[PDB]
């Protein structure tokens, strides 16, 4: 498939406000 | 009708996303994105193609090239966008292209957020992805498994 | 960086309009529409003005023409729309840009007045109302249009 | 109708 | 003295009105504002006594037009505005109607003034104006009640 | 009179610019 | 260029 | 000198603009 | 835009400095005010730019009367301060503002350092901190005058 | 234009 | 190599105090500011006044940034720095003092503070200046 | 006004940089350095200056020569970096500290990318850290460096 | 020439 | 007018 | 090689 699957993402500490 | 609504569609969220790439593109390296990934758990490799089998591994920036070289010669295409009607299998070939697009996206969100942000391009990446999401939700042109490594992020955008 | 951004967006509501005026084309002619307008109170007079500099009142049909053709002339125009990274931007670059969205504007302004019944009996509004409420808040958040300008679609805007 | 492509990044 | 500064108060808040006014008067019309009003609860009916005597009850358009005309004429009259005998019961008149101009905005066009993003003009003119006739008592309570509840806020 | 004091509906509500107030 | 209520049901 | 006068400068009305 | 409520505040608190100079019009003379200024430490020379540039050190008297026609005189420059809706205000419009009130200022000065104690005599002194305050409170508001600019009055200023 | 080189205050 | 870091940031906030002192110079005064100091409990000595200990102050730093034998290094060199910055460090403990609301007015709690975090963190670098001395602000820098 | 305090932080940063490149100008050659650089990617050429246009293609040590001459005759020009309180900074100021800042930044990367090494054998490394970042916290808070120009430290300008 | 014997630091908190 | 590894120090 | 701004 073109699509793979194998701490949270730093990005969405941005949002958290 | 659709149609023509989901051809302008693809065709501005390809330049707003090669725009916004382009904002980062020197930070998006070989040395820094051996692979073409979403976060630790979403990997993708390049396929064109037919008998879809053992696809490429590439690096993030080679896997970018290689997907918008693709989108473009398709958006180039008057027997697929009439500049004539649309062809039947339209639809399947624009999810295709739309499922594709989203993944850049989510590189750019997962490996060079930080470099947005400092390059002040936080609130355009987000109002493109808003309205990119959106323009997706109202056919399901990508199914929820594919926008799986953004699902926390569409919540909030909602 | 902000001038990219501008760009892009100008290019994409430009492509946008096209498409929506395209499915109402049949609905805008000479006899229908024979001035450009927004309304019995506004109407619009057609300059380039370098290849026309006194205003010209003609038809919405065919200005929309002179609209089209001119501002995708300038999107075309590599000194002012780059397309390597390596040219920069002119030093009016935003004016030129607050002149095209203005114009671009009018297009939604005739559309919504004359020929919204059109758009609704196609089943297209939510397509215009999306693309229009786009350009309304890229316009306004770096003040693209004066306000005297948008007074023909103010209590839409208001709503939205 | 003209669907304005920009250009790729990898051009630009 | 103190009619000096009346008067010049009197022009300024003229001019204020005239200006705020003119950022809606083109949402002001005769199919939006039918009549001169403050809400539903409150008409006003165009009179100044010399031309009109019979209050007429036009639309607010036609109202506000008829008023700056009127109040502009007097402020142009040298022998009000340089005193006369009466020149407070003058402009105690001219402030309580350009009051009105300011409780018709509030009450159906402060949408529009938001969206134009001239509330805070609208509403540090509206406060000067109304902490100036009440120091001098140049408007009554009963005349101010379409914006009573705003007035106590201020 | 010049000024003309209704009796409204019940079914009137505040007025838009006071909640702005709020 | 420029120069001197019927759509608008469709929003309330 | 004796240019001591309140003008009371009027700007035009909202009709007359 | 923000122009025609900054022409209209230009114009209401010119009225109001004439106004208030005017009761003290008496009290200010050559003997009294040899010069302009705000204090021992501030005095200002009067230059327009299309008679006088070289400033001219001059009473306080005449520097307001330099000053009172040289402003209205812009007032009255339709060019500037348009009277119409179809006349554009000029593109240095804020610049020339920002100027005018800068030099209404110095009236203000003047008034509160040398002549206090004829105001006070007239009890007139609320509408002079009246006029002040919301003076003050309208250029802080859109910067239209520079703090430097201001140091003849910042402890009053502070404690409003 | 200017160049550098209080009873009232005391009423506040 | 630390001499001349030292140098450089002496002559770096001499100019940085002077500007800033620059914005309150005229509401600084023999009426408002009889005395240095730092506050009722913190008195300076060069008596004179907090207008004229400053001016005292520059006029005698601007004389040693001038001296091409002190700063062209010499052995009290250091000792020489760590006295200039000791003194520069009262006018920072005077304008909080006594002129923080004037700061504000003219919107420039910023730029002390930002003057004033760089400047500390440099005397601290190196330990210019004791404890004792910076007592006055004593407050202030731990939550910076 | 925002002036003064631009004014002293580009004194200060120009007088940081020639500090720190003065510790490793022995280390930095024509041998070592044929070019200005700042890593492989990024090359400058001087020009701007009135006496030379063509940019000049020279060694980082004449291209920082040249550079720092020209910054400091700038710091000297009353009319560009008032001396006195009576004299106001000119129309241009803010468009004249950025180019200063621009170039003066280049010194920053050149010295990251090629020097590094010499600096940390001089235990120099905190205060060349000390003094970029002061330098980044600066120019970022009030946009004096268009962020296509700060390319060459992106990695270690996030980590700040 | 220092010797012993908060109005500004509420801006902080 | 415009056109390596000492990022290691920083881990 | 450093330069100071004026004190006043
Ligand atoms: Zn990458
Ligand atoms: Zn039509
Ligand atoms: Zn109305
Ligand atoms: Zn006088
Ligand atoms: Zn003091
Ligand atoms: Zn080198």
Redesign the pocket.
């Given at each position: 498939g073109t699509m793979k699957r194998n701490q949270r993402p730093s990005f969405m500490d941005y949002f958290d406000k | 009708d659709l149609n023509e609504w989901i051809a302008v569609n693809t065709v501005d969220f390809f330049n707003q996303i090669n725009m916004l790439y382009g904002t980062?593109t020197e930070?998006?390296?070989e040395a820094?994105?051996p692979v073409?990934?979403a976060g630790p758990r979403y990997e993708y490799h390049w396929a064109d193609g037919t008998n879809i089998k053992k696809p490429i591994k590439c690096?993030?920036?080679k896997y970018?090239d290689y997907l918008m070289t693709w989108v473009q010669d398709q958006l180039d295409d008057e027997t697929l966008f009439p500049s004539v009607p649309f062809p039947k299998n339209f639809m399947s070939v624009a999810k295709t292209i739309l499922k594709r697009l989203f993944r850049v996206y989510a590189?750019?969100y997962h490996?060079?957020f930080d470099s947005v942000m400092q390059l002040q391009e936080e609130a355009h990446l987000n109002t493109s992805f808003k309205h990119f999401i959106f323009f997706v939700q109202e056919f399901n042109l990508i199914d929820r498994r594919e926008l799986a490594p953004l699902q926390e992020l569409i919540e909030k955008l909602g």
């Open positions: - | 980062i930070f998006c390296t820094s994105c073409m990934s690096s993030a920036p970018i590189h750019i490996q060079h």
